[PDB]
Design a protein around this ligand. Structure first.
Ligand SMILES: CC/C(=C\COP(=O)(O)OP(=O)(O)O)CO
Length: 187
C-alpha cells in the first residue's frame, strides 16, 4: 500500500542497532544487535555513564539532530513493550517518569491489551487491531514523532510540533519476561 510505497520517499530509512553499553543490566542484546530480551536477574556489568540503571531501557547507537528518519519494530505477540525516541541528555541513573517533559516520546503496550501514550498523564489509545510491526517516524524540523502499523499503514499516534533541542535516540523498553523478543526490522 501507500505506506510501503512512500515511506522511503519521505523519510530516510535508519539502520538502527542497539547499543549494549546503554542497556539496563537486566536486558540482553542479541549478537546481531537488532533484538532485545529480558533476563530473570540483572547481569554483572559496569555502571558506566551511558547505561540506564533503573529503567529497563536500551538505545540505538546513533542519534539524530536533523532530518526525517524512520525505523520499524516487530513487537509480535509480546504483551508489554514501549518504543519511541528520547533526548541524549535524559536521566539514565535513578527513576524519572518517561514523559515528553523529561525527554521521552514513547508509546506502547502493557498488560497484553492496554495501548498508551507515555504522556503526563498517560493517555489510552484505542487501536482497532493489535499491531505486530510498528513504524516509528521522526521529522526533526517539524517536531513530529509518528507511529504507524507497518503492515496495514494505519495511524497509531503522533506527537505534534515538539521543539526539539537535543539529539534524539531510538529507545526501547521491556519490563516483562516473555518468550518473544522485541526486534528491529533491518533496513
Ligand atoms: C520501574 C519499572 C519500569 C518502568 C515503569 O515506569 P512507571 O513510571 O512506573 O510506569 P509507565 O512508564 O507508566 O509504564 C522500568 O523501566
Amino acid at each position: 500500500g501507500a505506506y510501503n510505497e512512500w515511506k522511503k520517499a519521505l523519510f530516510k530509512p535508519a539502520d538502527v542497532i542497539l547499543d549494549p553499553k546503554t542497556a539496563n543490566p537486566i536486558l540482553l542484546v542479541s549478537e546481531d544487535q537488532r533484538s532485545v530480551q529480558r533476563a530473570k536477574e540483572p547481569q554483572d556489568l559496569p555502571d558506566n555513564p551511558e547505561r540506564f540503571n533503573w529503567h529497563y531501557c536500551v538505545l540505538g547507537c546513533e542519534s539524530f539532530i536533523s532530518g526525517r528518519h524512520y525505523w520499524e519494530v516487530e513487537v509480535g505477540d509480546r504483551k508489554e513493550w514501549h518504543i519511541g525516541v528520547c533526548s541524549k541528555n535524559v536521566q539514565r541513573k535513578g527513576w524519572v517518569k518517561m514523559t515528553p517533559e523529561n525527554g521521552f516520546w514513547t508509546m506502547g503496550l502493557t498488560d497484553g491489551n492496554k495501548y498508551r501514550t507515555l504522556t503526563e498523564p498517560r493517555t489510552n489509545l484505542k487501536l482497532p487491531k493489535p499491531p505486530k510491526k510498528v513504524g516509528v517516524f521522526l521529522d526533526y524540523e517539524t517536531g513530529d514523532i509518528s507511529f504507524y502499523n507497518a503492515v496495514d499503514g494505519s495511524h497509531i499516534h503522533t506527537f505534534l510540533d515538539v521543539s526539539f533541542s537535543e539529539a534524539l535516540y531510538p529507545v526501547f523498553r521491556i519490563l516483562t519476561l516473555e518468550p518473544t523478543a522485541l526486534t528491529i526490522c533491518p533496513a
